[PDB]
């Protein structure tokens, strides 16, 4: 593809913990388009979580995480982050980053023809 995306920043956490997940992006890239993160547990399907695009870095964020999470963007070094705060045993699922050539933000894994590997995030009861 024209865009590469590799994401970072994921681990092993406990409940209550905060994680910054980032989003590079090398390429034939153009900032305001739209970036979408998505996760997926083992046999479930992959579910919208954040994203971002035009010219305004607007924010989208699904009712699962919210007021626990913001997303941002820094053109410059060609990254989306995902801070995500207050995490539970519930956000267990690797996390991946999607692209497409809009600035658009679309809650579908449909319309992204763009993806990262995706990173994992593990949250445990405290121990
Ligand atoms: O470049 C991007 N997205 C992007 C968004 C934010 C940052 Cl910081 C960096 C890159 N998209 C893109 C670009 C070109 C094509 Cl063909 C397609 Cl299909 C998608």
């Known amino acids: 593809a024209e865009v590469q995306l590799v994401e970072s920043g994921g681990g092993l956490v406990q409940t209550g913990d905060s994680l910054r997940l980032s989003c590079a992006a090398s390429?034939?890239?153009?900032?305001?388009?739209?970036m979408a993160w998505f996760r997926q547990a083992p046999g479930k399907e992959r579910e919208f979580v954040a994203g971002?695009?035009?010219?305004?870095?607007?924010?989208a964020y699904a009712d699962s995480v919210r007021g626990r999470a913001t997303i941002s963007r820094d053109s410059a070094k060609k990254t989306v982050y995902l801070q995500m705060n207050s995490l539970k045993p519930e956000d267990t699922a690797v996390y991946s980053c999607?692209?497409?050539?809009?600035?658009?933000?679309?809650?579908?894994?449909?319309?992204?023809?763009?993806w990262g590997r995706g990173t994992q995030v593990t949250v445990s009861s405290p121990g």
């Open positions: 971002i695009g035009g010219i305004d870095g607007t924010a």
């Open positions: 999607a692209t497409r050539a809009s600035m658009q933000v679309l809650t579908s894994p449909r319309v992204y023809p763009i």
């Open positions: 390429g034939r890239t153009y900032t305001p388009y739209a």
